[PDB]
Symmetry: C3
Subunit: 90 residues, 3 copies
């Protein structure tokens, strides 16, 4: 009798909970996408500036520090799927 009504009501309550958790897991999955994207933007923004200076008539020492700096920055960025713009040397 009352055991079975209770069992089914448990099951609904747990379902709702799993709904809540799953909804948090998908948001934790969006955020981790948002973090990757933030990193990708900063990465492209910083290389974008470096390459703008590199393609100009800048002194030879600043070219050394900027190339080196491009690697360090690029090293810190573990590995995201970057796609730096075509470039523009001529």
């Amino acid at each position: 009798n009352d055991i079975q009504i209770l069992k089914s009501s448990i099951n609904i309550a747990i379902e709702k909970l799993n709904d809540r958790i799953s909804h948090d897991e998908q948001a934790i999955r969006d955020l981790t996408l948002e973090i990757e994207n933030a990193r990708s933007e900063a990465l492209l923004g910083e290389l974008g500036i470096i390459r703008a200076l590199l393609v100009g008539n800048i002194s030879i020492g600043l070219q050394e520090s900027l190339w080196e700096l491009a690697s360090e920055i690029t090293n810190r960025a573990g590995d995201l799927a970057v796609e730096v713009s075509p470039g523009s040397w001529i």
Copy 2:
């Protein structure tokens, strides 16, 4: 008898769970705030550098690449509520 004691104890246990989930949802909400802020900082940091170069005596080609670069960066930043500093052209 023992059905009712069991029902109330279920209800407490579920409450605690919903407490845990709600506490995760508020942290997922802080992080999404933290991500926006990280993006805003990188955005302001990169425009800050670009505008420092733009207001100086830099070559005319570097000015072209930097203005263009300011848009691309600003385009990648979907739309955050930016507030770039007043500027400083004179």
Copy 3:
């Protein structure tokens, strides 16, 4: 009789749920680590560019705007445990 079988089955179901939540909490903890790291990278990338310009033969006004800019950027970065490279002024 059937009350006790039901009680134990509740306990397993709740355990599984707490497992799920705890697994979300550790991921919310990784993301908050990932956000800090994204901020640290952008921070180092932007100071890296600024210091490359600062150590060169740049005009005196651009040096003013860049030093100032280094503080504003560094101020916006609440306080992360930064570790800017040794520097390189000579």
